Structure 1
Amino acid sequence: EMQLQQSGAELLRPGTSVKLSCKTSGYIFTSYWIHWVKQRSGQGLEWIARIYPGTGSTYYNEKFKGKATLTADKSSSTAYMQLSTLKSEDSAVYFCTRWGFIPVREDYVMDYWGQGTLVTVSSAKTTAPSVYPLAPVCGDTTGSSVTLGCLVKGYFPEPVTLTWNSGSLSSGVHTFPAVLQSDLYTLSSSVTVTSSTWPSQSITCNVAHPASSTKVDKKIEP
């Protein structure tokens, strides 16, 4: 089982630098090229560079010379990419991938990708979120079914993790993408259960904001 695990989300101050890691397992690290790809705002992908861990040989997209530096630690099977002097355009998700093109064969083996690392370049302060329970009044959907919600607001930076009943409740759950407004994010999630479940049994919203080491659970009560 071939796997690439990337480091966690980074919030970087303008003008500073960061080193992202891509830990691999399940294959011979020194025998394949590892490529790094950048993704901005969504549909915008760009190819950065590639390195052959066996020799240290690297090739860079001209645009990224001086911006990206690739290295690889053979003893730990980890590839790294250092980004220098961060600016607005560097806020993006970066992926590492064992692309699979075998130059000698002029053919390909399967591509495996890391999960991606989100980098946020900002000088804005880290702020813990306030979690608010949303119990129905009109948004009860009469009888039969009832929808509840959780409002997470005023935090920075992303991400925040939200589950219901510790992850035990995932059916009929809708978690909306966080939206930034005045240097703070707001996120919400709704969960629909049958009138027979709630309020009889408890429904709790679980929120974690790693950047501020905030872990909060909110019980939705009538």
Structure 2
Amino acid sequence: EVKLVESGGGLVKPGGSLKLSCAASGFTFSRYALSWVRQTADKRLEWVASIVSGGNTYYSGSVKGRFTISRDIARNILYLQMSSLRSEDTAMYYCARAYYGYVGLVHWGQGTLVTVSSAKTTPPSVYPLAPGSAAQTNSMVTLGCLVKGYFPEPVTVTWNSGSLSSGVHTFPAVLQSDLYTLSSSVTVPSSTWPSETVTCNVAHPASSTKVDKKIVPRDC
């Protein structure tokens, strides 16, 4: 099977440099055209660069002279050296192989995140969102976690380590004052909480954070 895995993404200040890697397996590396394509917040895709089996390289004008695509046929690795980084370069970077010749883009990797900013890496604050009592008498109860003030993206949220999949809504983060904030709600039967434990698990790899927050009722 054909596999491509990007790596090297991270936080970098404007004007800085960063070199991305794309490890390949499952195919004769040398025989194909390889490309880097990026996706920004607006979910827009932007072809960035490619290198063909013959050695020729191609770049988009918004990147030419700053980004250098290269490969090491020996080690089955594709690279993308970035320099003079700009705020607008922030995005998810994927590498993809031609289907054949220089036709198509297939087996895209999961991509690596590159963030260009002067903001510092800061962990999130996790706060419980519990019902303001209200007798309920209702079949379902909704709980949640407010993850505030972190940087940069992303943050993952699970409930009871994944045990609670249904009734889960994790909202996209919003950037306010160069700080991100998002929320997640979960809905379980009234017979599940507070009798059983409900905990949201927040992760922020950038700060090596992995936090658990138990939702307890607001005593009355």
Closer, same or farther: CA 139–148 of 1 in aligned 2, 3 Å: farther
Q: Hey, which of these two has a bigger chunk of strand by percent? A: 1
Counterpart of 1:174, as a letter, is H
Gap change, CA 1:200 and 1:11, over 3 Å in 2: same
Instruction: Write the letter of the residue equivalent to 2:2.
Output: M
Q: Normalization by structure 1: what TM-score? A: 0.89
Q: Is the 8 A contact 1:203 1:220 kept in 2?
A: yes
Alignment of 1:39-188 (within 5 A): 39-52=39-52, 55-102=54-101, 111-137=106-132, 142-188=137-183
| 1:116 positional shift | 2.1
Moved over 3 A (4+): 54-57, 138-142
Please report how far the alpha carbon of residue 173 of structure 1 lies from its aligned counterpart in structure 2 after TM superposition. 0.7
Structure 1: distance between partners of 2:83 and 2:176: 28
In 1, Cα distance between the equivalents of 2:135 and 2:83? 51
Tell me if structure 2 keeps the 8 A contact 1:146–1:193. Answer: yes
Residue type of the alignment partner of 2:76: S
CA gap of 1:146–1:102, structure 2 versus 1, over 3 A, is same
1 CA distance for matches of 2:125 and 2:216?
17
**Number of residues paired by the alignment?**
217
Q: Is the 1:179–1:186 Cα contact (8 Å) retained in structure 2? A: yes
Gaps of 5+ in 1: none
Q: Distance in 2 between matches of 1:175 and 1:140?
A: 26
Q: Percent identity, aligned pairs only? A: 64
TM-score normalised by length of structure 2: 0.90
Over the residues paired in the alignment, what is the CA RMSD in angstroms? 2.1
Stretches of structure 2 lacking an aligned partner (at least 5 in a row): none
For 1:116 and 1:142, locate their aligned partners in 2 and report how far apart those are by CA, in whole Å.
Answer: 46
- Measure how far apart 1:38 and its partner are: 2.3
Q: Does the 8 Å CA contact 2:8/2:21 hold for their aligned counterparts? A: no
How far apart are residue 55 of structure 1 and its match? 5.0
